[PDB]
Structures are given as C-alpha cells and as structure tokens.
Amino acid sequence: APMGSDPPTACCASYTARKLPRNFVVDYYETSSLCSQPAVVFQTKRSKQVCADPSESWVQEYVYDLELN
C-alpha cells in the first residue's frame, strides 16, 4: 500500500539519558500530533536532534529560558 509499514511523522524512539545546557543548544523541535506520546526535541550545534521527556521539569525550564534574554 501507499503508506509504509510504520512511517513516522515527527516522533521519537528514544530520548536522551543525559544533561545538555541551553548554551550548548541551537534550537528545539516539537513532534507531530499522530503519536500518543509527545516529545521535546533539542537540535545541538555539533550533535543531532536531542529528544527529552516533556514530562520532566528541566525541559520546560530551558524552553522558558530560551525566550528570556
């Protein structure tokens, strides 16, 4: 059929089990609205995208600090 077996839109299979200071991050990215498990991505300068459990608090912290200057 047209649609593949399990073609993802903008979700994540695994998150990051470490810490990444906001200073060491360029921008962020959100997941589509098809998956039943939201995830906040964080594109790194040298590293690729970084998924983080939105449930955590540290996530919202950086998301707010980014807007602040």
The CATH number of residue 48's host domain is 2.40.50.40
The structure's method of determination equals NMR
Domain that holds residue 24: 1-69
What string of DSSP letters covers 1-69? --S-SS--SS--S---SS---GGGEEEEEE--SSSSS--EEEEESSS---EE-TTSHHHHHHHHHHH--
Gap between the Cα atoms of 54 and 41, Å rounded: 9
Total structural domains within the chain: 1
Gap between the Cα atoms of 2 and 31, Å rounded: 22
Burial class of residue 39 in the structure, from the number of CB atoms within 10 Å of its CB (0-12 exposed, 13-18 middle, 19+ buried) = buried
